[PDB]
Structure formats: structure tokens, C-alpha cells
């Protein structure tokens, strides 16, 4: 309840959107283990 604490939710909304696009170039079952 003092400075900021207002647009924090807007920033999180974009972080989740960016992460969704980040998992589009990962190769499924690429490493041997």
C-alpha cells in the first residue's frame, strides 16, 4: 500500500504470455537422458 503495487498484475499478464511463446521451439525427447 505505498508506491507501485498497481501495474504489477499487468507485468505478470505479459510474463505468462511470453513464457507460452517460449515453449514453441523446444524439441520433444531430444536429450538421451
DSSP string, 6-29: STHHHHHHHHHHHHHHHTTSPPTT
Domain membership of residue 31 (yes or no) is: no
Joined grid coordinates for residue 11: 507485468
Nearest C-alpha neighbor of 22 from the set 33, 31, 14 = 14
Residue 19 domain boundaries = 1-26
Joined grid coordinates for residue 33: 537422458
The two most distant CA atoms of the chain are separated, in Å, by 51
**Angle, CA of 23, 26 and 32, to the nearest 5°:** 140
Distance CA 14, CA 24 (A): 16
Joined grid coordinates for residue 12: 505478470
Distance CA 27, CA 1 (A): 44
Domain count, the chain: 1
Domain membership of residue 32 (yes or no) is: no
Distance CA 22, CA 6 (A): 26
Joined grid coordinates for residue 20: 507460452
Domain membership of residue 33 (yes or no) is: no
Distance CA 17, CA 31 (A): 26
Amino acid at each position: 500500500k505505498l508506491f507501485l503495487a498497481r501495474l504489477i498484475w499487468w507485468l505478470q499478464y505479459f510474463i505468462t504470455r511470453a513464457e507460452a511463446h517460449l515453449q514453441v521451439w523446444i524439441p520433444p525427447l531430444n536429450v538421451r537422458g
